[PDB]
DNA sequence: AAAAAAAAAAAAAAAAAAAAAAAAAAAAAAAAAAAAAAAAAAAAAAAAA
């Protein structure tokens with residue numbers, strides 16, 4: 001997991017078409033969706049964090065929100081990102097995940113050991129947190145994601161533990177529209193069942209809009 | 224009268240069994256507490272004219 005030949009990387013860097021090769025090289029098992037692929041590649045590379053003085057933090061993380069009507073490979077995109085990214089962890093708005101968004105402290109079920117079970121937002125501090133079914137979160141999960149995605153920290157006050165612990169993750173989320181079908185007559189905000197503060201903390205909003213197109217349908221079916 | 228004897232007869236030392244005294248003496252199991260987590264019942268706050 002350590003690189004010895006920077007030389008090949010740099011040779012590819014001079015290819016002058018490395019960008020389109022990179023974009024075409026993500027989620028190879030998903031047909032189409034090139035704009036989502038550009039956005040996911042950008043997020044996967046990320047920007048530059050910066051903090052003038054020590055008082056004006058600006059993240060370099062590119063958070064991406066895929067909102068699209070069902071059966072449009074959103075979860076497959078998140079699984080691809082989990083495969084490629086180092087320090088990627090996967091979580092869901094339902095209860096069907098090993099890690100949960102919110103930190104808690106408890107005795108571990110298999111260890112029997114009193115453990116600060118830091119959430120999925122801080123387990124991905126230097127990496128990416130993948131939240132599937134983003135619109136189906138708790139109120140607790142929602143305030144957790146809001147704190148991590150605004151402050152890039154998680155504040156515990158549970159047992160005797162008063163700590164703040166860092167969650168500098170890129171959040172990539174997939175959500176479904178309200179009613180299970182994206183309505184382009186409405187704005188994105190009134191389609192998704194997420195509050196404005198949550199949506200504003202995303203750089204890229206990919207509307208994965210599903211339409212009947214015989215050529216695209218045929219290519220996808222062949223795939 | 225003293226001169227050999229020839230015993231008591233005392234001492235030191237030994238034995239010599241008794242019968243009493245002296246000297247040795249952690250690790251294994253249990254329970255209780257305090258803490259957890261879990262099935263059930265119970266008590267809250269969002270729904271609409």
Ligand SMILES: Nc1ncnc2c1ncn2[C@@H]1O[C@H](COP(=O)(O)OP(=O)(O)OP(=O)(O)O)[C@@H](O)[C@H]1O
Nearest residue numbers: 029030031032069070071072073074075076176220
């Ligand atoms: N463009 C595509 N290319 C390749 N496979 C696709 C594409 N679109 C859908 N699929 C396939 O359709 C199936 C459904 O995908 P997926 O579960 O990712 O959809 P989803 O957006 O998560 O749906 P939901 O919103 O219901 O969770 C997947 O197995 C995926 O392989």
Ligand SMILES: [Mg+2]
Nearest residue numbers: 074075132133
């Ligand atoms: Mg899905």
